[PDB]
């Protein structure tokens, strides 16, 4: 569900894509993501709620 | 005619009002009365 | 009721390959393969 395809500001989310997985899914775990830049290029990032 | 512009007793049919016998014009007559006995007693 | 007669009924209304499932090997009922059709024109008198 993305909330960006119908309702961005609102926030409400609306199905925009289906996975076809057969198979039911028991387990997830964040993948940390690094930026690669010199000190002057690096940047504060939002952080996300789970 | 309210309904056709656009509750719908009519519409669903499966149940229909049914007027109180008396007008509210006519239930004013019957008071206009009683307040004129009032008035006499 | 007096209900008006039904009149001027106004109608709203692809093509998925079945060909995984009638080639290669089938999978063993345990192993049973599922496979989602969504808005897509179908053919179940030719299969």
């Not at chain 1, 989310?13 to 690096?42: C, E, G, N, W």
């Amino acid at each position: 569900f993305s909330s960006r395809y119908v309702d961005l500001y609102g926030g409400n989310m609306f199905q925009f894509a289906t996975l076809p997985v057969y198979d039911t899914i028991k387990y997830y775990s964040i993948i940390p993501h690094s930026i690669r830049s010199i000190q002057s290029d690096r940047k504060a990032w939002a952080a996300f709620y789970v | 005619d309210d309904c056709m512009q656009q509750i719908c007793a009519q519409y669903v049919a499966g149940y229909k009002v049914l007027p109180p016998l008396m007008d509210v014009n006519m239930e004013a007559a019957y008071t206009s009365s009683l307040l004129g006995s009032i008035a006499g007693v | 009721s007096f209900e008006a007669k039904p009149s001027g009924s106004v109608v709203e209304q692809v093509e998925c390959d079945f060909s995984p499932l009638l080639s290669g090997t089938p999978p063993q009922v345990y192993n049973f393969k599922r496979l989602v059709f969504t808005n897509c024109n179908y053919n179940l008198t030719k299969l």
